[PDB]
């Protein structure tokens with residue numbers, strides 16, 4: 001019940017006491033571990049499930065309890081008043097509103113509890129943008145452009161999140177239909193293949209279905225599809241001058257430029273759901289900065305993505321006859337070298353997976369020492385390449401669901417009543 | 419209860435019904451996943467936990483029921499009598515003996531149930547050597563030498579397992595004290611540096627204390643340390659001609675040979691515990707053939723192992739002045755290229771991690787189809803390098819514990835009552 005985690009590269013041993021405060025479930029049992037399932041039920045929030053007055057007050061109390069404890073005002077007049085106050089508003093309005101300070105604590109701590117996120121050492125430095133006064137898609141678009149501009153910062157990226165109005169009755173949900181603010185378009189081909197980004201083929205079609213006019217190029221930045229107050233969603237193009245992009249060249253292989261590769265600097269996830277004291281913020285786009293492998297290993301080399309490995313290996317003149325030459329691996333390494341190099345050269349913020357895993361280990365040590373633990377999903381913290389030469393590999397981790405939290409939610413087109 | 423797993427690269431969806439036939443715990447609860455803990459309590463077997471007739475027959479019957487189903491004899495006269503036979507023998511003698519066929523089924527299925535093993539496609543082709551008549555350390559040394567000779571097979575490796583007498587009262591255990599039959603020594607120098615394999619420093623010291631004349635080189639094959647019937651362990655030198663080794667060179671880099679590296683061909687794990695129908699076999703060495711990354715990534719590049727990365731990078735003339743150059747990644751690929759090249763060049767059986775994972779995916783699908791499941795520990799199945807360009811990465815997996823099964827067990831020097 002007071003659990004121990006060990007690093008097998010350093011013999012460091014941490015005691016975890018924080019898992020005791022765990023609220024939600026993991027999808028695992030004593031009989032079967034599901035720690036490798038992508039989207040178990042508990043990590044997803046279906047929109048039919050609106051909160052009731054009785055479920056909502058305990059959730060609100062538990063949030064306010066930790067909030068006021070963090071500010072060293074636990075059990076104090078201020079704490080009591082607030083609980084009283086929130087309690088009253090719930091009894092009357094069947095919901096409640098977060099104070100700005102709480103909202104900020106909420107956001108920051110949702111990130112802090114993101115067990116799958118390796119970049120959490122930066123959790124306290126998050127820029128929170130209150131957009132709960134927003135009422136239209138145009139209004140949403142404006143907030144999102146401002147987020148994107150504040151975040152990009154001419155390459156010197158800064159973490160940020162913009163929070164739109166909380167769910168009410170499921171009929172008035174704010175939703176960004178894009179999974180990321182900035183993503184490349186994917187087009188089905190009559191000759192069979194796929195142009196651009198295969199992971200976006202469906203969305204890119206729904207964009208065209210809703211009236212987008214696509215350049216049908218290979219790195220076409222998609223338009224935003226914004227849904228305010230449960231209404232039908234609207235198409236807005238992000239101003240080109242606000243979408244920072246980095247041409248991909250290699251520091252040694254001058255032919256690399258010829259592949260014509262580029263990526264965008266701003267990783268900004270928009271389809272998740274921020275939950276705070278029982279309140280459901282279904283549009284809450286948030287951003288930081290890439291880890292090299294995310295673009296280079298996954299976005300470029302994964303089969304269901306750009307899949308350029310064969311093409312790169314070819315230009316390297318590696319022996320591609322047999323898998324045991326590890327040509328796939330060799331290529332994969334140069335590709336990530338190039339991505340790191342392109343970004344650094346353009347002075348666009350990026351972290352390599354060695355630096356970032358080392359940072360996380362520090363963060364862990366910090367959280368165990370000052371918080372008594374740090375929930376963590378090993379399957380997602382260990383980088384998709386060079387796994388065991390990074391320190392997170394030998395680090396035992398405990399995975400459990402704290403709150404406030406980011407959660408998954410169904411894609412809007414499945415659920416949106418038109 | 420039916421369960422689904424998805425592959426996110428091919429959109430294949432499989433249904434697991436085999437998890438229902440699961441007994442042992444995982445170490446997880448609803449409120450915590452411990453899927454990354456290396457040796458959970460339930461994956462281990464302490465020798466003091468010796469089984470009473472109480473729980474033994476339920477376990478016996480479960481296993482016998484499994485066996486006779488596989489051979490399509492469930493409920494047959496032979497099945498009923500065997501149950502009765504095992505029943506009498508337990509209430510009469512507090513344990514029982516497996517028949518030859520039963521022991522073979524058991525060992526094969528423990529492999530098949532080994533959720534952390536990527537190589538289980540080969541599970542049905544396991545050579546089982548019954549060493550249950552063994553009574554001495556010298557008897558063990560002989561069985562073990564024969565295991566090594568058979569399994570090596572001049573470099574064309576064969577899967578084998580040798581099975582020594584089951585535990586009784588936990589005071590007469592058979593143990594092989596080596597973590598592997600073949601492993602290099604490790605010596606803690608005075609200056610803090612280690613010579614050889616850092617992994618084996620402690621075990622080396624024991625051997626040295628037991629009276630092993632240590633040659634003290636970077637690649638010394640350790641002596642077998644063998645305990646029969648609860649007696650104090652004894653030192654045996656594996657005959658060098660039986661230990662197949664491969665000098666490591668690189669197919670393009672000529673200076674790589676001058677790193678002085680080599681490795682043994684035959685991975686043979688000896689410190690685990692074979693559980694079959696309640697019986698515990700505390701000494702049951704098993705061997706197959708290496709996946710390349712085991713040597714190249716873990717054995718050579720782990721900071722707590724030979725840790726040659728810096729010297730390789732130095733000789734490759736990489737930019738080692740910041741991680742951003744991915745020199746650590748770059749050298750690691752070279753070293754694994756070298757290990758695969760050297761082995762294949764010498765016609766010693768080895769598999770690359772691309773071939774191995776692709777095979778496992780195929781195996782697993784096959785297992786879902788004709789068994790209703792395949793337990794698998796993602797954390798262990800996914801290769802320690804180039805993870806997401808192998809097809810196991812995007813494959814969702816269920817982990818659960820079936821019997822028969824291989825378990826962990828405490829190091830013998832920690833639990834052994836010495837005689838002198």
Ligand code: HEM
Pocket residue numbers: 111114115116117118119120122126159160161286287288289290291294351356380406
């Ligand atoms: C500042 C630099 C950051 C880095 C380097 C980073 C890195 C990562 C990486 C590598 C992943 C795994 C995703 C994948 O590889 O496919 C991830 C997941 C995630 N990150 Fe972070 N991130 C950063 C900032 C943030 C911020 C600002 C937030 C929230 C405000 C956040 C919350 C999350 C969440 C919620 C997930 C997925 C969790 C889940 O699916 O359960 N991260 N991040």
Ligand code: HEM
Pocket residue numbers: 461529532533534535536537538540544577578579690704705706707708709712769774798824
């Ligand atoms: C023949 C080729 C084989 C290959 C390529 C192979 C591969 C592997 C690998 C790579 C691991 C993970 C070890 C690590 O990297 O730390 C593993 C684990 C394991 N394998 Fe296999 N293996 C083979 C044969 C066998 C055999 C013959 C047995 C038993 C009869 C076996 C049973 C196991 C067990 C019990 C584990 C660890 C499970 C645990 O710790 O719970 N494997 N295997």
Ligand SMILES: CCOc1ccc(-c2ccc3c(C)cc(N)nc3c2)cc1CN
Pocket residue numbers: 267268269286287288289290291294
């Ligand atoms: C299949 C959907 O899974 C995801 C879930 C979350 C993220 C994610 C979410 C936020 C991130 C942030 C904020 C920064 C960053 N560098 N990477 C991030 C990655 C990525 C993925 C893509 N593997």
Ligand SMILES: CCOc1ccc(-c2ccc3c(C)cc(N)nc3c2)cc1CN
Pocket residue numbers: 685686687704705706707708709712
């Ligand atoms: C802390 C103990 O962890 C392990 C557990 C099992 C194995 C293992 C066990 C059996 C193997 C076999 C039979 C073949 C092979 N190629 N590799 C094998 C590797 C290795 C290790 C070493 N990481």
Ligand SMILES: C[C@H](O)[C@H](O)[C@H]1CNc2nc(N)[nH]c(=O)c2N1
Pocket residue numbers: 008393394395396397454455456797798799
């Ligand atoms: C902490 C974690 O359980 C530990 O480092 C594991 C991770 N996965 C592994 N996977 C394999 N195949 N071998 C290992 O030794 C490990 N080590």
Ligand SMILES: C[C@H](O)[C@H](O)[C@H]1CNc2nc(N)[nH]c(=O)c2N1
Pocket residue numbers: 036037038379380381426811812813814815
């Ligand atoms: C099935 C498996 O869980 C899935 O492929 C996971 C594995 N680990 C991952 N890790 C990260 N960082 N991102 C991912 O998308 C995934 N995918």
Ligand SMILES: [Zn+2]
Pocket residue numbers: 028029032033034035446450451452453
């Ligand atoms: Zn689990």
